[PDB]
Structure 1
Amino acid sequence: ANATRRVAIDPLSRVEGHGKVTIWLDDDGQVVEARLHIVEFRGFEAFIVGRPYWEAPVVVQRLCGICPVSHHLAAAKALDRLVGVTQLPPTAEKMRRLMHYGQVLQSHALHFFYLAAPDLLLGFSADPAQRNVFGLAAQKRELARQGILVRQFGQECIEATAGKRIHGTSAVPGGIHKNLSRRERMALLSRAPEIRSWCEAAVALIERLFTEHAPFFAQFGSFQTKTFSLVAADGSLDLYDGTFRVKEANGAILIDHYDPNDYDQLLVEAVRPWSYMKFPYLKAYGEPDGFYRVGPSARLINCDRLTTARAEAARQRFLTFDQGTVAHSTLGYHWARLIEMLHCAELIEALLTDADLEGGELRARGQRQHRGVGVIEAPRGTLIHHYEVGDDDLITYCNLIVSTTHNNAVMNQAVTTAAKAFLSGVTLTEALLNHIEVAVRAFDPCLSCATH
């Protein structure tokens, strides 16, 4: 309100999409308020209407070029339900998993190695010309080569299961339109151990970092907010399929095993005039109590377990760390994220010994209905697709609530926390402004996704 001076980081760097933060100061050099403006919008929910249902997995994935697989499968899952199919046949289930596990693997490696680690490894103040993936390639080459190669293996898993590294077509209502061949499966399986061993190294790395920098990273903030994600029935983490679980900061399971199909009785979206990204919250708590957060650290907090050994060992270490604090840390997201990346490698390593990837059980069909909801844990948090379809076969309604959209409040909050931490003691540097962007980057924000 009494804010007198305005300063803007515009546009946000090393994130996907078009975002801008405004930071409102006063005459004392003190910061009243910060604000995350998500500054782009294409309107997929409204222009997809009128199109045939079978287009959706293919067109709607154009929301994003990092996680189109997340939208491809979400749309597929929703249209499975439409076409009357809940359990997939085995071959389709396993192909879809491999696509997704590969998707999470590469997306996490895209973020750490290309977008985030330029700061974390060359330091938050490094001269801009170096503070990027090329400065990293020059300085810490063998590290950057590994990351690139981790991302590659993920994408190459997608090429095999979807038809392209970016924007495939194989996930269809009922299942999948193809299987792996033996050569694709072996080629992949042969690479998989080495990729996983580099993800191991990457976790060792990010721990070593916190061991040394943890007091400093705490300046960027904590959350007392609720955590939202998909657990499986048992209820370990399952990135492909599961029902909703919400824990309170202390956690404290508020809601568990809530049917994704009823997401509309559970959730509501608020709109502020200053962002195209909406503000989702839990209906029955209103705002700002009903806000929550999703992604890497929400999952590792929420789930009972990770189904792969090495990554669960490392999860314990992430939650125990001096001594609980960091799990609810803003920059905690990076340690969580690299753990999921290891987890995915370990999944994949196993999944490619399953001969059902070569199976002939690709597709089921059932009773047609008019509505379908598909949910999946996308790399950056829980994703929801909702479609309604006429007897026309033309979509009559689409609603998407996308992972990054959920963290709108918490990202705003964290932007504010670091703005105070680092700018109230004027005067402004480029390097101190970068400190704000660093806080944003921890969330791996996908702003195209967020807005759609």
Structure 2
Amino acid sequence: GKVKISIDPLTRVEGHLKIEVEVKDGKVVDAKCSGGMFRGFEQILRGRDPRDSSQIVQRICGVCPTAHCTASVMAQDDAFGVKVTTNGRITRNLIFGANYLQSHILHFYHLAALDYVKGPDVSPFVPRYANADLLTDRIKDGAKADATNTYGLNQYLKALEIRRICHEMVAMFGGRMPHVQGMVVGGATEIPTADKVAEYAARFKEVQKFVIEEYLPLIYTLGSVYTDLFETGIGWKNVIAFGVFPEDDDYKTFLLKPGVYIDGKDEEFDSKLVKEYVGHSFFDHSAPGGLHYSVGETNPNPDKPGAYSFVKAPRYKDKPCEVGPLARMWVQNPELSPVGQKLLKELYGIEAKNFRDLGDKAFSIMGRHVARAEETWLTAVAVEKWLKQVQPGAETYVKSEIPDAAEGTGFTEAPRGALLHYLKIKDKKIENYQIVSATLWNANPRDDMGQRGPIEEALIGVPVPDIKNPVNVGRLVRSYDPXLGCAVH
């Protein structure tokens, strides 16, 4: 009595995604995640001036280009042997941090929320699933249903302007957005002025107000209606984080620290243990067993028997691990926002001080949205601080020369999860460039040993009581905020 459901395109994610599930007795019993578009940035990059990479790589994704730019310039800093100044480090954090706010807001509202909020009766808000299990369906008190839906929809609409303001903030020291000009090997290209810091701060305060007063309350309210969605979309419960937003010049300390949590245990992150498998991916590897990214190979093969995705399969110590706000917030275990502490008590009867106090609820559809909203607040607190630390007039750029032969790796966290760029230089040109990038860790296919990727695994057990309206499949997938451009590059 199994039924197959195939969803292609899985919309309201970035890029080209197919999801296939098998449903039996009202639950998903198997799943496959497929990325269907390939460009091959790692091939395109070969033979170029290594400095070009921080422009080229941004075109992997127009939603998170600052993350790729950050990883690239850090790889170049490493390979070129140059140390960034204090003000360069802070300026890079302000450019990138403004897009963290943009990205999370864009995701929750403009990608995720139409699985919960009933939009106006015009395209692109319709057509939609006939039985969509929305706020207007769930809340049985009709006036409360209308009021809550309108509350959510008005925030969706306002968030269009808030996310645009976040890009004004990115452009302030980044030049423009999408695709900044302001980050390069050696630091940042424009020294912040007192006036421009103040202009960034004024916009930031408006974004921060929306985060605290509108976004956080909506997420906690939404979860209080969809309590069942804290109880499904579980998955491996393995997470990894690389560290993001260095808080000192030697990159020893971060806003959100590196770490790994596997099978209920915390461990340190060791980059030597990252490798990629391609048994079910459209790629050929010269040797069996998975490849560390420092010897990564990008030889596309859409005819590979048994393969079903252009996404490779990264594993850590041969374990599937997921990434993103859930991962970072679990690893760091920061104190929850005052709003979160209050609304968890008021709306759920939950006493919680730190992120891990959510327990099992963290590893779920709603847990992922909560992690993302809380991280948006946490990032805003950091930006508010960096705005006081940044020094008008202080040098942000240090000169460098392209080395003949070198290697470098840039480690960061994209808004969607752990990101590194590995750069190998020979004869002053890119010899190899290997990208291991956020959604790659989430939306990957099975490895050579048949272990499902995190989204695939998290789909197992998701309720599908109505096969014609399988709304929880998309809800699970979108809780991960996938970027398939990033996943495949």
Please give the range of the TM-score, normalised by the shorter of the 2 chains. 0.7 to 0.9
Deviates most, 182-191 or 402-411: 182-191
* AA of the residue aligned to 1:436: V
Is 2:411 the counterpart of 1:375? Answer: yes
Q: 1:354 aligns with which of 369, 383, 389?
A: 389
CA contact (8 A) 1:371 1:387 kept: yes
Q: CA 1:246/1:51 → structure 2, altered by over 3 Å: closer, same or farther?
A: same
Deviates most, 368-377 or 63-72: 368-377
Matching residue of 2:266: 253
Offset of residue 245 of structure 1 = 1.2
Offset of residue 355 of structure 1 = 4.3
Matching residue of 2:311: 277
Q: Distance in 1 between matches of 2:57 and 2:259?
A: 26
Is 2:451 the counterpart of 1:406? Answer: no
Is 2:192 the counterpart of 1:207? Answer: no
Q: 2:106 aligns with which of 84, 103, 110?
A: 110
CA contact (8 A) 2:337 2:374 kept: no
CA contact (8 A) 2:365 2:475 kept: no
**Counterparts of residues 120-199 of structure 1 (less than 5 Å):** 120-122=116-118, 128-129=126-127, 140=152, 142-199=154-211
Q: Distance in 2 between matches of 1:153 and 1:346?
A: 17
Q: Distance in 2 between matches of 1:346 and 1:31?
A: 39
More helix by share: 1
Offset of residue 196 of structure 1 = 1.0
Offset of residue 49 of structure 1 = 0.5
- Matched residues, number: 416
Q: Distance in 2 between matches of 1:119 and 1:30?
A: 19
Q: CA 1:99/1:31 → structure 2, altered by over 3 Å: closer, same or farther?
A: closer
Kindly report the root-mean-square deviation, in angstroms, between the aligned alpha carbons of the 2 structures.
3.1
Q: Distance in 1 between matches of 2:29 and 2:201?
A: 54
* AA of the residue aligned to 1:280: P
Offset of residue 120 of structure 1 = 2.8
CA contact (8 A) 1:223 1:249 kept: no
Deviates most, 194-203 or 137-146: 137-146
Task: Give aligned-pair identity as a percent.
Answer: 26
Output the TM-score relative to the length of structure 2.
Answer: 0.77
Deviates most, 203-212 or 13-22: 203-212
Q: Distance in 1 between matches of 2:30 and 2:333?
A: 37
Offset of residue 73 of structure 1 = 0.9
**Counterparts of residues 388-403 of structure 1 (less than 5 Å):** 388-391=424-427, 393-403=428-438
Unaligned runs of 5+ in 2: 120-124, 137-147, 281-306, 343-351, 445-452
Is 2:67 the counterpart of 1:70? Answer: yes
Matching residue of 2:323: 294
Q: CA 1:357/1:414 → structure 2, altered by over 3 Å: closer, same or farther?
A: farther
Is 2:79 the counterpart of 1:82? Answer: yes
Q: Distance in 2 between matches of 1:380 and 1:195?
A: 20
Offset of residue 339 of structure 1 = 1.1
Question: SS at 1:13's partner residue?
Answer: coil
Matching residue of 1:316: 353
* AA of the residue aligned to 1:165: M
Offset of residue 81 of structure 1 = 0.5
Offset of residue 15 of structure 1 = 0.6
Deviates most, 140-149 or 359-368: 359-368
Q: Distance in 2 between matches of 1:416 and 1:304?
A: 27
Q: CA 1:357/1:249 → structure 2, altered by over 3 Å: closer, same or farther?
A: farther
Offset of residue 184 of structure 1 = 2.1
Deviates most, 7-16 or 200-209: 200-209
Is 2:50 the counterpart of 1:43? Answer: no
CA contact (8 A) 2:14 2:483 kept: yes
* AA of the residue aligned to 1:57: S
Offset of residue 178 of structure 1 = 1.2
Q: Distance in 2 between matches of 1:399 and 1:352?
A: 33
